[PDB]
Amino acid sequence: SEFGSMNVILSIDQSTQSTKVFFYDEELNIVHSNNLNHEQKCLKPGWYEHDPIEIMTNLYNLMNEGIKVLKDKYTSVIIKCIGITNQRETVIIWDRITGKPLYNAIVWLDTRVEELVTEFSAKYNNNDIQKKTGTYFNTYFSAFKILWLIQNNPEIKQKIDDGTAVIGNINTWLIFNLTKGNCYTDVTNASRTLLMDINTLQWDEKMCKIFNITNMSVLPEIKSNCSNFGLVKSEHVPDYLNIPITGCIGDQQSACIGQAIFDEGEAKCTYGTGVFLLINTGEKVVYSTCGLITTICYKFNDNDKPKYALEGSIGTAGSGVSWLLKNKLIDDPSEASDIMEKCENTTGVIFVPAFSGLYAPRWRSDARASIYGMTFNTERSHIVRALLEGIAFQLNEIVDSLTSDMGIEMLHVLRCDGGMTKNKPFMQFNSDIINTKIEVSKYKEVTSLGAAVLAGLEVKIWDSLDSVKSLLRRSDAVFHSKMDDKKRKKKTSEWNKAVERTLIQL
Amino acid sequence: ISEFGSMNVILSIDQSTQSTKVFFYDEELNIVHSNNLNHEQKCLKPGWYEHDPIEIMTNLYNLMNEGIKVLKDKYTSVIIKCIGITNQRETVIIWDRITGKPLYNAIVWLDTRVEELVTEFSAKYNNNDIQKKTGTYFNTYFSAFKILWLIQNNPEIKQKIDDGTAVIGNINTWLIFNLTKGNCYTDVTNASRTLLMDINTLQWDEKMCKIFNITNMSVLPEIKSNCSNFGLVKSEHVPDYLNIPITGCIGDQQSACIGQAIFDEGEAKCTYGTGVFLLINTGEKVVYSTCGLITTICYKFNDNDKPKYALEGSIGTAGSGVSWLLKNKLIDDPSEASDIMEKCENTTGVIFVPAFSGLYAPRWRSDARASIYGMTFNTERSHIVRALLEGIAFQLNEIVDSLTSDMGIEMLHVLRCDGGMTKNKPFMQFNSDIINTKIEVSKYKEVTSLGAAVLAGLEVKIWDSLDSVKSLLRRSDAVFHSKMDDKKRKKKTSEWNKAVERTLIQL
Ligand SMILES: Nc1ncnc2c1ncn2[C@@H]1O[C@H](COP(=O)(O)OP(=O)(O)O)[C@@H](O)[C@H]1O
Ligand SMILES: Nc1ncnc2c1ncn2[C@@H]1O[C@H](COP(=O)(O)OP(=O)(O)O)[C@@H](O)[C@H]1O
């Protein structure tokens, strides 16, 4: 119909929970979006799988309905290019010629490989693994899952050996189906497999040896984030025939592009159910001394030195707000904002909210949630505030660890997203204790945003990264530290003591 | 009007902190009638706590006169045979011996204006010699530091003590003085709560009075035994009571031991109310505590009798931990606490050291705070509520294990329990397990007025022997025996010990 010309960028965000499509214009407004859940298959405990075909069929459905919606509004709809971003680590093995999965996707959240990680960790110098791949052995990354498949599945062992299978992360799987055969990954995804030399950006021989990948040609070419990943040829999305796929990045790194985290000492934190952090380390490979992850932030082109990052997680810290709600200590999450406005301090109350142990730098799985310093005067308010403060303290320990390893004194910025960022009193406390400028982005959808940006740069939609930079840096709330260093030292040491009581062996 | 025949009764007066109660017991110890009246709890500035001695007296006369009218409007021949007095202890009044005017309000045991003096006097004296003399260290609760404060900030009180025309009395003395229009008496149990009595010889102490500026020892009432003739009622305020004998007198906590039939060594009572505190009968042995608990007099029936002794321990306002769960929405009603301990068999590793006001005896750590340990995302209101309740039991067990170690015994004969936490049977059962004791909950709520009726009736020979009353008094309404093996007790109390360690370790 009637409304004229419309040039768009398709950004696909294939998430854990669902599949999203965003149609961006070249000013980076969302002209249209939709999404579709897929089933989160948890068979026995610790298992977590996806139907790779369900995901693909959801994707086609979304692509086809989006373009009809756009074409029913505008006169000349042009989809210029396609950006792909995705749940990392999650792995599929399939048949190179029919494209049938030889098994479901095994999601990053899956832990059936826990016993193997223990075994292989007892046998190998985890220190040499960290130098090679940027991380110790773990249950999240793809390799131990690829291994489990090789060990409990004769067909997968055999078609890996004969060279007629493909081992792919979700991006590879998306691009292979859309282009009817192309076998690619990018640097950021490749870095989440346990198979890639973190220094040379190549599939690693010794790592594959460790993991029984006997034939290295089943692994897709590692491309850079901007690159030609092929043309759409699928007959499932007829309107998209011959449209170029031109950006590809893992979700967490995509959100760094959406948050314009481009230079060293620039960092982004998500405060959702999970609370985790990425610090851009410039062109320097920094290895952590406290067990945090060395990753690839991005590499735009083949000529570029890649930019590196450091990664840290405090698990599902935002679920401590759900736990206050279960125990009636608040009635609505919004009440947490209210409480931290009214309540200036906790009157000496400290909450070490280690419900699942303490993560980096301490690494203590045996730590539990502990509240200290209460009197008859203590109220829901004080306990709720302490919990929230306990989240900030954990986060500060990670920042103080990563910044110590990087040889810097302070973060340039911490760009923040997720639902806890609606709490401004809480944002302010994080700024105080960490000693950092905190900016909350203008955009919710920083993850799809980064893939659109990458895809648009590759086809030269904008004339330079600087053109997009100032668009991307728009903040919606800004925070500077209002706490003196003497008071920071005093509080974080009261925290340290409370963590000591929590951990001392008796 | 009044046609239901003959009625012989014992009057029991319970002059409490909060109010004044009258109980008319028959000689089967049924309550034929009771009534009561609040008096004002005066908290001027912080730490201060006073009563109007006249308001109390006037409440008492009002209750006495309305009770007897009620009885006389029902019965044909009402006979009030004797009167028993029990009372809030430690609370002190100084008055004029001849007019009976108070020279100042009563200063309630709960009052702490004397805190600086206790600190001073404690820096100066061997608190160890004080304990041997009086059964306790210096404190803000007992009468002497309040009598002292009065002497120091009040020239009239200093002067009329010096010249011999004033009386220093606990609430019993005050009651008996006004009722009999002049008699000046106390009993052994009240005397023991003044800081002025030799805990061994039952005499007012010279040296202790020296310490406290009681320059003239004749202002102190004669120490009587618990059964004794305290005088006849002569007051014209209660005309119907003229010439009725006052024949029992005891401090409230010791009266409850009499009502709970706590007569032999190794027999103990615990109250689980807002406050949670314990008394263990030590037989005829004066046992001094090695952990700062109080050596007191349980009772002495007659002048010929060797007194029976007790040990006393308090965990402060532990029952208020249940109010704190309610403020923080962790339960909706105290009754939900019983429900929770039925359903919830354990706390899945969760421990609550409920030290809201610090830890009392044996540890004595004012710097301890309330602390909760061992939680995961799976922890629920139930687990925290049960942990708190279990934390109360563990504190109590430390006190029992202290007192029993000083007494040279291995186990309590019984623990007779009262208060509203005793409606929670799963909680009573856990205390029985951890402390390792038989727990009996009495048939009677009103064990405090019960004891004074018993004492008054024995004095006038209403019953033929203490054994006559004993079996009546020992009626229980619930009984608990330990269902926990000693290996599990050792494992739990040692997990508790470690949690108290984390709470207290200095960093
Ligand atoms: N006003 C608030 N104050 C503190 N925490 C909040 C507030 N609102 C939401 N949260 C927490 O934020 C998380 C939800 O944020 P979101 O980013 O949508 O989660 P997810 O990462 O699961 O998508 C939950 O942990 C929730 O309890
Ligand atoms: N079912 C119960 N479980 C646990 N505690 C209870 C229960 N019912 C009442 N309580 C507590 O008992 C105390 C009240 O008992 P009571 O002996 O009447 O108090 P007080 O000593 O103030 O007169 C309060 O601490 C109250 O919260």
Author numbering:
A (entry chain A): -4 to 501
B (entry chain B): -5 to 501
Kindly provide excerpts from the paper associated with this entry.
GK catalyses the rate-limiting step of glycerol utilization, with phosphorylation serving to sequester the sugar in the cell. Each domain is constructed around a βββαβαβα core that is characteristic of the sugar kinase/Hsp70/actin superfamily of proteins. In agreement with gel filtration experiments (data not shown), PfGK is a dimer in the crystal.
The PfGK–ADP crystals have different cell parameters and it is apparent that domains I and II have moved apart and that the enzyme is in an ‘open’ conformation. In the dimer, the long axis increases in length from 97 Å to 117 Å, exposing a further 1500 Å2 of solvent accessible surface area around the active site. In the open (ADP-bound) structure, interdomain contacts such as Gln12-Thr268 and the salt-bridges Arg83-Glu306 and Glu109-Arg363 are ruptured. Aspects of the glycerol pocket are maintained, with a pair of ethylene glycol (cryoprotectant) molecules clearly mimicking protein interactions formed by glycerol. However, as a result of domain movement, Phe271 and Tyr135 are significantly displaced. The adenine base forms polar interactions with Asn418 and Ser332.
